[PDB]
């Protein structure tokens, strides 16, 4: 499974199994029992630009902590205040998603990082996907290692 998303270099540490972070709590959650590898590479050269596009976004406020591997796309204003938001920005009402801000010369800690999450079923599942593992002629009626 390939999961493509945007996070700051410090934020990448927050998205880990058994790790608690503001990024982990609202926009994206990684399972504690999840099995796989998370790969992060600096995107300062491409993602960061003089234009500084705000297309990348993260959820500043969520009513409940995100469940592991669950996606929330709701744009409804969070009703922190007793007064109802009414679906529009208001006093004591804060937008759930805050647009990401990135800089072309951003420091390595603040550099935007592209992050991919990989999940593998492994054992107990028919092998649709396989390692190159060049196959060797099967041997029968003899004691031999088999994969």
């Amino acid at each position: 499974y390939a999961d493509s998303f945007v996070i700051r270099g410090d934020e990448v540490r927050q998205i880990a199994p058994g790790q608690t972070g503001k990024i982990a709590d609202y926009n994206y959650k990684l399972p504690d029992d999840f099995t796989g590898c998370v790969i992060a590479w600096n995107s300062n050269n491409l993602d960061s630009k003089v234009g500084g596009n705000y297309n990348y976004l993260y959820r500043l406020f969520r009513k409940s902590n995100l469940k592991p591997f669950e996606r929330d796309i709701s744009t409804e204003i969070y009703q922190a205040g007793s007064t109802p938001c009414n679906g529009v920005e208001g006093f004591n009402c804060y937008f759930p998603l805050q647009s990401y801000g990135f800089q072309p010369t951003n420091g390595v800690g603040y550099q935007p990082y592209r992050v991919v999450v990989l999940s593998f079923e492994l054992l107990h599942a028919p092998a649709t996907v396989c390692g190159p593992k060049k196959s060797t002629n099967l041997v029968k009626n003899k004691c031999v290692n088999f994969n």
Partner: antibody
């Protein structure tokens, strides 16, 4: 916290010269470094800015200074090379340190250094 | 993309300084978290002031203040000290080379 420099220098116009700016009190990789030149009795000019991971080598829109900026992380020294040196090019040169991303991204200063492009 | 500053203004202690940072092209940016202020004293290389108060507010006297909108950012000072005047620079940000203020020097009399 401390930014060092080269002192002033004299070169015949038309040649090149390499310029230095030692950086101390912070990791060179952590904070980006940029060169700004201010002509005497004139407003400052921002030649270029360098990304922390690798040299941005930005070039100004319209008229171009043509100065080349390179950063060596192991040296911790900011390097500037100027080509086609001109009297107009001459300006006080200050290397400056970037901070975390926000509105302007720069706080510390090298005190600045003269430029003499002359016969 | 291109910026200009008031030609001159000269002031006195106690006065509340506002200089006109004149921005061509767009007013600020989509982020609305851009623009910067600077002070060059003689023999003292320039210094950060306030960049829309995004971060690092501490270290600057709160007498320093201001805001910005449109094509002109609003400078603010209060109770200036006769040794504290220096040219203020409002460098641009996020669009094209940043560029810098034309430069205005306060000249207290007396």
């Amino acid at each position: 916290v401390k930014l060092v420099e080269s002192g002033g220098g004299l070169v015949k116009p038309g040649g090149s010269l390499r310029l230095s700016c030692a950086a101390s009190g912070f990791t060179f990789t952590n904070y980006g470094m940029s060169w700004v030149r201010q002509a005497p009795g004139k407003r400052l000019e921002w030649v270029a800015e360098i990304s922390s991971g690798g040299s941005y080598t930005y070039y100004p829109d319209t008229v171009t200074g043509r100065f080349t900026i390179s950063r060596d992380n192991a040296k911790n020294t900011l390097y500037l090379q100027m080509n086609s040196l001109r009297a107009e090019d001459t300006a006080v040169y200050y290397c400056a340190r970037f901070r975390y991303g926000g509105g302007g991204t720069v706080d510390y200063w090298g005190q600045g250094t003269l430029v003499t492009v002359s016969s | 993309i291109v910026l200009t500053q008031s030609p001159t203004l000269s002031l006195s202690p106690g006065e509340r300084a506002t200089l006109s940072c004149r921005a061509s092209e767009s007013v600020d940016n989509y982020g609305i978290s851009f623009m910067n202020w600077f002070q060059q004293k003689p023999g003292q290389a320039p210094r950060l002031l306030i960049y829309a108060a995004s971060n690092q507010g501490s270290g600057i006297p709160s007498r320093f203040s201001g805001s910005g909108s449109g094509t002109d950012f609003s400078l603010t000072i209060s109770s200036l000290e006769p040794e504290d005047f220096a040219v203020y620079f409002c460098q641009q940000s996020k669009e094209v080379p940043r560029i810098f203020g034309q430069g205005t020097k306060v000249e207290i009399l007396k």
